[PDB]
Write a protein that binds this ligand. Structure first.
Ligand SMILES: CCCCCCCCCCCCCCCCCC(=O)OC[C@H](CO[C@@H]1O[C@H](CO[C@H]2O[C@H](CO)[C@H](O)[C@H](O)[C@H]2O)[C@H](O)[C@H](O)[C@H]1O)OC(=O)CCCCCCCCCCCCCCCCC
Ligand code: CLA
Ligand code: CLA
Ligand code: CLA
Ligand code: CLA
Ligand code: CLA
Ligand code: CLA
Ligand SMILES: CC1=C(/C=C/C(C)=C/C=C/C(C)=C/C=C/C=C(C)/C=C/C=C(C)/C=C/C2=C(C)CCCC2(C)C)C(C)(C)CCC1
Ligand SMILES: CC1=C(/C=C/C(C)=C/C=C/C(C)=C/C=C/C=C(C)/C=C/C=C(C)/C=C/C2=C(C)CCCC2(C)C)C(C)(C)CCC1
Ligand SMILES: CC1=C(/C=C/C(C)=C/C=CC(/C)=C/C=C/C=C(C)/C=C/C=C(C)/C=C/C2=C(C)CCCC2(C)C)C(C)(C)CCC1
Ligand SMILES: CC1=C(/C=C/C(C)=C/C=C\C(C)=C\C=C\C=C(C)\C=C\C=C(C)\C=C\C2=C(C)CCCC2(C)C)C(C)(C)CCC1
Ligand SMILES: [Ca+2]
Ligand SMILES: [Ca+2]
Ligand SMILES: [Cl-]
Ligand SMILES: [Cl-]
Lengths: 37, 29, 34, 81, 97, 504, 137, 38, 451
């Protein structure tokens, strides 16, 4: 567990590691917005 | 479980939000 | 300018309405406890 | 092209999403309720988690007679008290 | 005339009871108080001419002698079968679960 | 020139040499029939229709001769086991000889039609080009086939002018060739009813005559002539191949499941008779009936015919063979000599024990004995160290009733185990394994080989059908597609209807 | 079939007393078993000593008897060989050896009661499968 | 067995040196178009 | 928008980053933002692990891969690898996660706002791929940076608390390394050892002195090479040997990273020194050996004479000889006789496993360890069901060694594929036919027929 003071942030901490994958997904949203030119 | 889904939705939306904002303001996409 | 209900429309639909419903049933299932 | 409307025009139109923001969730919820009300079990004859065995039994209710199979199954269902 | 000696031995008391001279040690788990201490002493001090000879094993406690007497009815002895006792098979006979 | 796989296409516009080729083929097939019959007669032992019938001996054409009434040899024996019978000319030998002669005559005719291919008969009187009027030919041949089918049903199968057909009891104990009356009620469509076969041939024969007359007299609709390319002989090839693979799948099916035309005395029992323990049930019924009439166990079991006991044995199950396990069943388990009798297993308490039978699926199977209620009492353990059910622990014994071993009891565990091992196969037999150097491995019967060959050929002929249907319907493009093909015919939205240029 | 109160009713002691476990207790028992025991005792066997299983009859023939709640809890505090002769905490997980078996460190009395309950109830459900090993999978 | 060992070691070394010096011998220039890659 | 479409750039969207080859500013952006992604992952993953960490449960039972890395460095752990303080893990995670914001900031800046090319902005930061000297110079800077990092490992080991030593006398513990191995015969001796069984090349490093001294050597080598490359330009033979372009250098780096990936796979699968089993779980060999140990112990307790116990095959049921005669565990684990671990070595004598030590000297802690490792063998399903493929659901376990070996084999392999792809493409492009054959000048048409 995280130090007691940080406990309220457990749910955020649970989700953070996944964020880098969203960047790959973001590349496609972006490319979709410029029509894959 | 609700806090996790809420953080996911804010972070997940942030990207498409950046793209949408730039598309709206004729940004350098 | 374009027709709406085509043979294509029928085909798309018979493959789509069932899957939407099915997926919703499956998702219902994910919570069932023994 | 074949004469029907391009998919991209349809799925990028407002009308489409007006229709389908209604129709898609409706079907999804209908499926959900198909399971959550337990109707799926009744329609297909699938055992619920408490209807595989009688309390003490450990023998599979295997169908053993072709032409009295229906009756065998019904009997199996009765023995679940 | 060729005979499988283990199968043959199953037709003796070996097939009905714990044979102190042949049976693998895990069998002693079948009855209260025999495993592993007494089981070990029994296997270690085999073979026995008779069941009651198990009582003469050196260093036994009175409690141990008691348990043995209570379980003599579950024991037997037959001739040592080389095939069952070689290879240390009485301690591990290649059978698990 | 022509690629190797197209050499026979030279016959397509050569009716005379096509006829010649067919004659040669027919000669080859008839010669095969004669040769096969002669080899089988040269190898067949007729001395024991009980435990060494033809189907144990890898006989393939002999059962088909037997099926239609050829049961005797010029040498004096019959397949039903009679002596001193005079079968006349139409013994197995007479049939073989007839087929050989036929083969030769057909060969000569083939030579004639090959040399004299250019007959005026084969030319179209208008164009002077070679031409066959296939629809009318169809009418003629259909009519002829009808007459033959009818005649076969009405005279041969009825016994009105002919020998009849092979028929038996439901357990294949007393089979013989008998006249069979047609069954005109719905049981005529029961596959196991021979009368149905007779009524079939009479009625379908008449229908063939009528439809044949129709096809002689009535020309094809222009629309069907055009659609099915009825001027192109390869269409006939295509549909004939389709019909033929259909028939082959059907005979494969009736061979595997059994029918009145696939009797177990000619082809062997089915796998399903083993599956349902059909003969075991009949044997037990007869034994119980014997015991109820006051017979001893010994007497009751001794009254069971050896042939019936022999049917209740997995080595005669056609689903126990191997693709490359070649030859007669006798080459495997041996030549059956005698029933040893029924083995009854008992434990030291005297309870009767029953050996669990081997299902067809299993090349090998454990030896497990249960009481009447299926509770395990004995087995042959793999691991011994924690064995609880060994024959030795349970003092299993075996007593035999009926057969060679009638009245004997064995108590020594090796022998009892040996008989239990044999009991997994059902009733236990003594075999001659020396005569044929039998290797002890089950082989299938002619039922199995027939079924295999015909299911495979039927399946391949499905490809044949597809191929020639394609060649027929796409003749115009089979050297390739139009060099000046309009990209507009292929791009979408140019024609409302695909291919149609008048829909721009 | 259902997980009835009857099924969840197991011997509390060797004297004829039973306890009825709650569904929550059973699920907790399964969870704690997975946590502390299943690495060795998956399905009721013992991987580092397959001669000894967790079948009820076997626990019943252990010394002292282990086919009840009190016996199993005691085993979890002070484990012995099958005959009771030597104490084996030093090579077996227990409260007594929670220093060298750290997964025992936070197990409460209630936890041990739950585990014991899982161990006695499981065979009533799974039958021969429990302690049966691969033969019965 | 030592002799076989030495023989194989020498053979292998010989071919490995062929491979290495071979690819060091102006390999980029050995193509049908643009040769000046240095 | 300069070059960002296929018509201008010559590259389709799916090869979009190839548009970046000669735009040093946006390319710098890409690199920095990516480094941001890596650091971000280290941080977030560390904090996730810590948030999920139950300190009394073994790490390897909890799906941890980063915390074991921090622990191996001596942070947060004491005797037997027990967790005494979780705060250093928290620090590592937090500091990475905070640093990733910075890298991300610079990356986004350079990628969308900063100068698209750097050459006109600055002659120091600008570069031409075809400029061999500038390439070796930047290469030199990075070599110096890596050398420094290796010396940071040395520093941690020697001056800042030491490293976790599984081999520490009296049991595994954090230990300060005061006498790192500097003898080049040992250090490069590792580089000259067979990669095959019982040798295992660098994967065989089995003591922290060798690791640390090795990092002293790597540190100095890297700094010296960095200086070398800043002060030199490529010799003629190298000029004629290589293709000199961005994609080519990329291909070289891809081949290198593939190789390193395979090495890491073997390292985490076999080595239990820099990957302590206290943190990562037993190795496959370790757990098999542990099984043999476990039953040798059980059966010996029952009275078995394990040295003389003949197995079904004729080989010793518990103990046999290796092909060079060493006494080794029997059964299938005969293959794993090259295994070495602190729980087993006290039973080892000059001739291998010592029968007298086995009879008399096996301690309860050894039995415990063998049982634990035997029952935490690195076998499990993709859905993390622990044990053999036929095991029933019950145990939630897949060893970290398996996750890291499998992951890094997959990555190393695809990186070999990448290497082939880019080396070949770089060759074709340098030679001028990467886009296809000139119809009017098809080389084969000017070649004589083969026959
Ligand atoms: C330019 C490149 C040049 C190449 C040219 C060809 C020259 C030959 C190269 C050798 C090929 C490798 C074969 C053997 C691989 C090996 O057995 O790998 C294992 C070894 C480690 O060996 C083990 O290392 C162990 C060391 O641990 C010991 O020491 C430890 C201390 O912590 C512990 O105590 C441990 O218990 C103890 O046993 C033991 O020595 C073992 O017996 C020993 O088997 O790893 C290692 O050497 C390092 C890993 C080597 C790379 C892995 C090979 C993968 C390559 C395939 C890629 C796919 C190709 C795709 C094409 C499309
Ligand atoms: C319908 C066809 C048929 C059937 C069902 C039988 C069945 C029977 N005959 Mg018979 N036989 C046949 C045709 C047939 N035969 C023919 C045409 C001849 C003349 C050569 C013979 C000659 C003959 C003799 C001489 C004998 C038999 C015997 C027997 C029996 C033994 C069967 C056996 O062991 O086969 C074994 C079957 C196989 C090993 C399967 C062969 C599979 C081939 C090799 C596959 C080829 C694959 C191919 C090359 C792949 C191409 C790929 C490419 C397209 C890419 C059996 C009852 C024997 C008997 O016992 O008589 C008393 C006996 O002695 N037969
Ligand atoms: C009544 C049955 C029948 C008939 C009359 C034909 C007739 C014809 N076939 Mg056809 N065919 C058939 C069944 C039949 N096929 C079946 C069932 C298949 C699927 C397996 C095919 C597949 C087929 C193909 C793929 C092709 C033909 C073609 C041809 C034509 C030229 C054949 C040739 O030149 O080969 C000459 C053959 C040889 C020189 C040697 C063949 C050796 C075989 C493969 C092995 C040995 C066979 C053995 C002797 C036969 C035993 C008898 C068997 C029934 C057990 C010809 C019109 C070809 C065609 O249309 O050309 C334009 C062509 O391409 N056929
Ligand atoms: C994959 C299967 C298949 C395919 C692709 C073809 C394709 C071809 N066949 Mg056909 N054919 C087939 C199977 C097939 N056949 C079968 C199984 C038979 C029975 C022997 C035939 C008999 C046949 C003949 C006699 C002829 C063709 C011809 C043709 C060609 C023209 C198309 C046509 O006539 O279709 C035929 C239509 C079908 C195959 C579809 C039938 C659909 C049925 C009626 C549905 C029945 C439902 C059923 C009653 C439900 C109850 C099920 C029950 C189990 C409870 C063409 C090359 C002709 C030819 O080659 O011209 C050049 C031609 O004369 N075929
Ligand atoms: C590691 C992942 C990665 C990275 C670092 C890059 C880097 C870059 N890509 Mg990309 N790319 C990627 C993956 C990646 N790519 C993938 C997977 C694809 C295939 C879908 C592509 C396809 C692609 C194409 C087709 C192209 C690029 C190009 C570019 C560059 C300019 C992008 C642009 O102009 O922004 C325009 C977009 C925006 C202004 C929208 C916002 C984008 C920002 C960066 C998002 C930042 C979000 C972040 C959470 C903010 C944190 C800030 C905080 C620290 C304060 C840029 C250097 C282009 C290039 O080559 O130009 C010469 C180009 O044409 N890329
Ligand atoms: C690979 C790393 C890298 C590189 C090569 C560059 C290169 C460049 N940056 Mg920079 N930049 C980076 C990372 C990097 N940046 C990051 C992470 C950020 C976010 C904080 C920025 C933010 C940034 C801005 C906001 C700007 C630049 C610009 C510049 C240019 C001029 C820099 C200068 O004059 O320094 C001169 C030297 C100094 C000012 C002293 C440097 C002190 C350093 C930080 C000491 C610590 C070094 C230490 C070893 C780093 C280890 C980090 C490691 C743990 C990852 C130059 C092209 C400018 C530009 O492009 O103008 C148009 C510009 O305005 N960059
Ligand atoms: C990432 C770091 C890095 C990189 C990319 C380079 C890259 C470059 N260096 Mg090197 N260099 C480095 C670090 C690095 N160096 C360091 C740390 C040092 C100090 C020790 C040096 C010292 C150095 C010198 C002294 C020289 C180079 C040279 C060169 C260039 C040609 C190298 C080449 O041909 O290698 C290919 C390698 C060979 C041809 C050696 C023989 C190949 C054998 C057969 C391979 C055996 C290895 C095998 C895979 C197994 C490994 C285990 C083995 C030890 C048993 C090249 C530009 C040369 C140059 O031109 O300088 C300007 C040059 O002379 N470098
Ligand atoms: C039988 C029946 C019949 C008929 C019915 C039908 C017809 C049905 C239909 C319906 C259908 C029709 C179904 C639906 C569906 C599908 C699903 C169930 C869903 C889904 C999706 C998915 C899940 C996907 C995903 C994945 C993949 C696959 C792809 C991509 C990737 C991913 C990951 C995304 C009748 C009544 C007459 C009578 C009797 C009975
Ligand atoms: C170029 C581009 C690309 C990419 C992008 C990127 C890669 C960028 C980056 C980077 C990144 C990486 C970003 C970020 C994030 C970070 C941050 C934002 C930091 C902060 C942190 C926090 C805030 C902390 C807090 C904490 C505390 C301290 C303790 C514990 C708890 C907590 C967790 C709360 C793409 C594909 C889109 C495409 C186009 C272009
Ligand atoms: C820390 C460590 C230590 C130490 C380390 C060492 C000291 C190592 C090293 C260094 C090194 C020393 C490494 C390596 C190798 C190198 C490379 C990797 C090579 C490659 C080459 C190339 C690649 C070339 C290519 C080709 C040729 C072949 C021919 C011609 C053309 C070309 C040039 C292209 C130890 C282990 C004790 C312990 C643990 C830790
Ligand atoms: C001419 C002359 C003569 C003679 C004739 C003859 C001498 C006879 C014959 C015939 C013959 C004597 C020949 C034959 C037949 C055979 C064949 C034709 C067969 C074939 C075979 C098959 C085809 C098979 C195939 C395969 C294999 C081989 C095995 C397995 C698989 C199968 C089966 C598929 C006479 C006096 C009559 C008079 C008239 C004229
Ligand atoms: Ca429930
Ligand atoms: Ca023989
Ligand atoms: Cl047991
Ligand atoms: Cl083993």
């Amino acid at each position: 567990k995280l130090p007691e003071a940080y406990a309220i942030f457990d749910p955020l901490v649970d989700v953070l590691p996944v964020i880098p994958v969203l960047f790959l997904a973001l590349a496609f949203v972006w490319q979709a917005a410029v029509g894959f030119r | 479980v609700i806090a996790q889904l809420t953080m996911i939705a804010m972070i997940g939306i942030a990207g498409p939000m950046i793209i949408f904002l730039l598309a709206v303001r004729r940004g350098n996409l | 300018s374009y027709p709406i209900f085509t043979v294509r429309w029928v085909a798309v639909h018979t493959l789509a309405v069932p899957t939407i419903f099915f997926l919703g049933a499956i998702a219902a299932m994910q919570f069932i406890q023994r | 092209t074949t004469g029907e409307r391009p998919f991209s025009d349809i799925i990028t139109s407002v009308r489409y999403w007006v229709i389908h923001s209604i129709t898609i969730p409706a079907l999804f919820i209908a499926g959900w309720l198909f399971v959550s009300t337990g109707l799926a079990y009744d329609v297909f004859g699938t055992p619920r988690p408490d209807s595989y065995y009688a309390q003490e039994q450990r023998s599979i209710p295997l169908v053993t007679d072709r032409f009295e199979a229906k009756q065998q199954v019904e009997t199996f269902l009765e023995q679940l008290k | 005339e060729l005979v499988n000696v283990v199968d043959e031995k199953l037709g003796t008391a070996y097939g009905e009871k714990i044979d102190l001279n042949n049976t693998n040690i895990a069998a002693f788990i079948q009855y209260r108080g025999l495993y592993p201490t007494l089981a070990k002493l029994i296997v270690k001090n085999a073979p026995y001419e008779s069941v009651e000879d198990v009582l003469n094993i050196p260093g036994l406690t009175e409690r141990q002698k008691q348990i043995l007497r209570e379980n003599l009815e579950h024991f037997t002895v037959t001739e040592v079968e080389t095939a069952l006792v070689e290879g240390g098979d009485r301690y591990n006979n290649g059978l698990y679960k | 020139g022509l690629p190797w796989y197209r050499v026979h296409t030279v016959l397509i516009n050569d009716p005379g040499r096509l006829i010649a080729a067919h004659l040669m083929h027919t000669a080859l097939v008839a010669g095969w029939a004669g040769s096969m019959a002669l080899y089988e007669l040269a190898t067949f032992d007729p001395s024991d229709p009980v435990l060494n019938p033809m189907w144990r001996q890898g006989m393939f054409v002999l059962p088909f001769m037997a099926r239609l009434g050829v049961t005797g040899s010029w040498s004096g024996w019959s397949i039903t086991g009679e002596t001193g019978i005079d079968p006349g000319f139409w013994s197995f030998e007479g049939v073989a000889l007839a087929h050989i002669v036929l083969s030769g005559l057909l060969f000569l005719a083939a030579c004639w039609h090959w040399v004299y291919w250019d007959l005026e008969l084969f030319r179209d009187p208008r164009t002077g080009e070679p031409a066959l009027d296939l629809p009318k030919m169809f009418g003629i041949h259909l009519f002829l086939a009808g007459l033959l089918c009818f005649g076969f049903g009405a005279f041969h199968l009825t016994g009105l002018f002919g020998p009849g057909m092979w028929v038996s009891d439901p357990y294949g104990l007393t089979g013989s060739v008998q006249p069979v009356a047609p069954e005109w009620g719905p049981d005529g469509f029961n596959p196991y009813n021979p009368g149905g076969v007779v009524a079939h041939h009479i009625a379908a024969g008449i229908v063939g005559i009528i439809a044949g007359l129709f096809h002689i007299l009535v020309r094809p609709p222009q629309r069907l002539y055009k659609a099915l390319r009825m001027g192109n002989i390869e269409t006939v090839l295509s549909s004939s191949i389709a019909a033929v693979f259909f028939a082959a799948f059907v005979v494969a099916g009736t061979m595997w499941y059994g029918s009145a035309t696939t009797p177990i005395e000619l082809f062997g029992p089915t796998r399903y008779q083993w599956d349902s323990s059909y003969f075991q049930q009949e044997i037990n019924r007869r034994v119980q009936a014997s015991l109820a009439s006051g017979a001893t166990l010994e007497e009751a079991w001794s009254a069971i015919p050896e042939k019936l006991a022999f049917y209740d044995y997995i080595g005669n199950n056609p689903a126990k063979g191997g693709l490359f396990r070649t030859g007669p069943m006798n080459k495997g388990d041996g030549i059956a000599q005698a029933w040893k009798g029924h083995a009854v297993f008992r434990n030291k308490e005297g309870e009767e024990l029953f050996v669990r039978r081997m299902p067809a699926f299993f090349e090998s199977f454990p030896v497990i004995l249960t009481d009447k209620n299926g509770v395990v009492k004995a087995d042959i353990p793999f691991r011994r160290a924690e064995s609880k059910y060994s024959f030795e622990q349970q003092g299993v014994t075996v007593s035999f009733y009926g057969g060679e071993l009638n009245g004997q009891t064995f108590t020594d565990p090796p022998t009892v185990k040996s008989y239990a091992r044999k009991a997994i196969f059902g009733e236990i037999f003594e075999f001659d394994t020396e005569t044929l150097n039998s290797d002890g491995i089950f082989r299938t019967s002619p039922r199995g080989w027939f079924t295999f060959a015909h299911a495979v050929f039927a399946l391949l002929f499905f490809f044949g059908h597809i191929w020639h249907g394609a060649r027929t319907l796409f003749r115009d493009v089979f050297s390739g597609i139009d060099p000046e093909l309009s990209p507009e015919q292929v791009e979408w939205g140019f024609y409302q209807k695909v291919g149609d240029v008048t829909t721009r | 079939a259902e997980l009835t109160p009857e099924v969840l009713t197991v011997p509390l002691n060797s004297e004829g007393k039973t306890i009825t476990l709650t569904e929550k207790q059973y699920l907790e028992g399964k969870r704690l078993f997975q946590y502390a025991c299943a690495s060795c005792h998956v399905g009721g066997i013992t991987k580092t000593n397959p001669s000894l299983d967790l079948r009820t009859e076997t626990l019943a023939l252990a010394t002292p008897p282990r086919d009840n709640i009190e016996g199993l809890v005691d085993y979890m505090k002070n484990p012995t060989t099958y005959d009771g002769e030597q104490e084996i905490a030093e090579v077996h997980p227990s409260l007594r050896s929670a220093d060298i078996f750290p997964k025992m460190r936070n197990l409460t009395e209630k936890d041990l009661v739950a585990i014991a309950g899982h161990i006695l109830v499981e065979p009533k459900i799974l039958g021969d499968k429990w302690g049966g090993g691969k033969v019965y999978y | 067995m030592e002799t076989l060992k030495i023989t194989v070691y020498i053979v292998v070394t010989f071919f490995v040196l062929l491979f290495v010096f071979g690819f060091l011998s102006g390999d980029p220039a050995r193509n049908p178009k643009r040769k000046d890659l240095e | 928008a300069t070059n960002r479409d296929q018509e201008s750039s010559g590259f389709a969207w799916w090869a979009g980053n190839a548009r970046l080859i000669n735009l040093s500013g946006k390319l710098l952006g890409a690199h920095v933002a990516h480094a941001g992604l890596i650091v971000f992952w280290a941080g977030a993953m560390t904090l996730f692990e810590l948030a999920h960490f139950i300190p009394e449960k073994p790490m390897y039972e909890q799906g941890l891969i980063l915390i074991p890395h921090i622990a191996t460095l001596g942070w947060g752990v004491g005797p037997g690898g027990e967790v005494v303080d979780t705060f250093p893990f928290f620090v590592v995670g937090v500091v990475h996660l905070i640093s990733s914001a910075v890298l991300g900031f610079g990356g986004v800046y350079h990628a969308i706002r900063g100068p698209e090319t750097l050459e006109e902005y600055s002659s120091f930061f600008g570069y031409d791929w075809k400029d061999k000297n500038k390439m070796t110079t930047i290469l030199g800077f990075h070599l110096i940076v890596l050398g420094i990092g290796a010396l940071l490992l040395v520093a941690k080991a020697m001056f800042f608390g030491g490293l976790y030593d599984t081999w520490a006398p009296g049991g595994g513990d954090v230990r300060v390394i005061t006498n790192p191995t500097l003898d080049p015969r040992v250090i490069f001796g590792y580089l000259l050892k067979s990669p095959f069984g019982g040798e295992g090349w660098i994967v065989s490093v089995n003591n922290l002195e060798d690791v640390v001294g090795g990092h002293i050597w790597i540190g100095l080598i890297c700094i010296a090479g960095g200086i070398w490359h800043i002060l030199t330009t490529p010799f003629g033979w190298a000029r004629r040997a290589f293709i000199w372009s961005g994609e080519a250098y990329l291909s070289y780096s891809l081949g290198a990273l593939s190789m390193m990936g395979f090495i890491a796979t073997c390292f985490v699968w076999f080595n239990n020194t820099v990957y302590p089993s206290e943190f990562y779980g037993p190795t496959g060999p370790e757990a098999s050996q542990a099984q043999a140990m476990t039953f040798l112990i059980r059966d010996q307790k029952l009275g078995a004479n394990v040295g003389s116990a003949q197995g079904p095959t004729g080989l010793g049921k518990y103990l046999m000889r290796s092909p060079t005669g060493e006494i080794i565990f029997g059964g299938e684990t005969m293959r794993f006789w090259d295994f070495r671990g602190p729980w087993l070595e006290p039973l080892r004598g000059p001739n291998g496993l010592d029968l007298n030590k086995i009879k008399n000297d096996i301690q309860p802690w050894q039995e415990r360890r063998a049982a634990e490792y035997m029952t935490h063998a690195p076998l499990g399903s993709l859905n993390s069901v622990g044990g053999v493929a036929t095991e029933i659901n019950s145990v939630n376990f897949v060893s970290p060694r398996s996750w890291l070996a499998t992951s890094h084999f997959v990555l190393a392999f695809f990186f070999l594929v990448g290497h082939l792809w880019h080396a070949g493409r770089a060759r074709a492009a340098a030679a001028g036919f990467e886009k296809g054959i000139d119809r009017e000048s098809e080389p084969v048409l000017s070649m004589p027929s083969l026959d």
